[PDB]
Scaffold this active site. Structure first.
Site, mmCIF file in Angstrom:
data_model
loop_
_atom_site.group_PDB
_atom_site.id
_atom_site.type_symbol
_atom_site.label_atom_id
_atom_site.label_comp_id
_atom_site.label_asym_id
_atom_site.label_seq_id
_atom_site.Cartn_x
_atom_site.Cartn_y
_atom_site.Cartn_z
ATOM 1 N N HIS A 80 -28.937 10.830 -28.706
ATOM 2 C CA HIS A 80 -28.360 9.716 -27.963
ATOM 3 C C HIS A 80 -29.066 9.582 -26.620
ATOM 4 C CE1 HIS A 80 -25.310 6.723 -28.186
ATOM 5 N NE2 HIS A 80 -24.789 7.017 -26.998
ATOM 6 N N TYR A 101 -29.193 7.508 -17.663
ATOM 7 C CA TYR A 101 -28.178 8.045 -18.557
ATOM 8 C C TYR A 101 -28.296 9.550 -18.474
ATOM 9 C CZ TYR A 101 -25.579 9.305 -22.819
ATOM 10 O OH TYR A 101 -24.756 9.900 -23.733
#
Ligand SMILES: CC1=CC(=O)O[C@H]1CC(=O)O
Ligand SMILES: CC1=CC(=O)O[C@H]1CC(=O)O
Lengths: 115, 109
Positions: free
Chosen positions: A34, A47
């Protein structure tokens, strides 16, 4: 000055719980996937995803039980326009498809910087 | 390797207003400057609780602020744990933090 301005961006903090039937071994691998998928994500400045490794239970302050959290995610967006580029992106939509596979339950917190 | 990071979910005391709690979060941040053994402290309010999640929504109740501590090494963490100014900072914590959940995190990337 970079780190300071970065810290005041739009930031959303996520508590991740893995799917009940997914192994911890697999969940860790899917967190790494991810993160890799986040690279180059339209509108996203940063992120980060981390595993919860420990839950020190011995608190000075009364302890808050929130159950088992498996990972913690966080997104930074440099502006409202960039957040919108992200929200409209097909590429984000594909990232979220991956999220549906390895995230069992999710709590987002939109944060506000105080300093 | 990487810095030790501990994330915290903070709930304000029932005796305190949301405004009293914000101001104490800023005081707690100011107190942390130059804290032995500590690399960085951050505290942020929770401003929004969106529920449009797509994956199942997790309800953890009302969380008022997020805190986070960074330590450059386990030796610095121990210096921090031994320190009397850390102990005094935690007494301030007892005043404005009603309930707390710590998470020790691990880097993946
Ligand atoms: C936004 C997100 C933070 C995260 O960890 O994953 C995405 C949400 C998702 O993929 O459903
Ligand atoms: C460690 C801490 C993180 C935080 O936000 O406050 C301190 C704990 C405390 O003051 O009791």
């Amino acid at each position: 000055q970079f780190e300071k301005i970065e810290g005041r961006m739009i930031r959303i903090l996520y508590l991740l719980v893995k799917p009940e039937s997914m192994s911890h071994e697999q969940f860790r691998k899917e967190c790494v996937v991810h993160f890799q998928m986040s690279a180059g994500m339209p509108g996203l400045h940063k992120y980060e995803v981390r595993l919860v490794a420990g839950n020190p239970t011995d608190t000075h302050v009364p302890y808050l039980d929130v159950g088992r959290i498996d990972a913690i995610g966080e997104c930074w967006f440099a502006s409202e326009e960039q957040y919108q580029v992200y929200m409209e992106s097909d590429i984000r939509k594909a990232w979220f498809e991956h999220g549906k596979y390895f995230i069992g339950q999710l709590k987002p917190f939109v944060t506000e910087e105080l300093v």
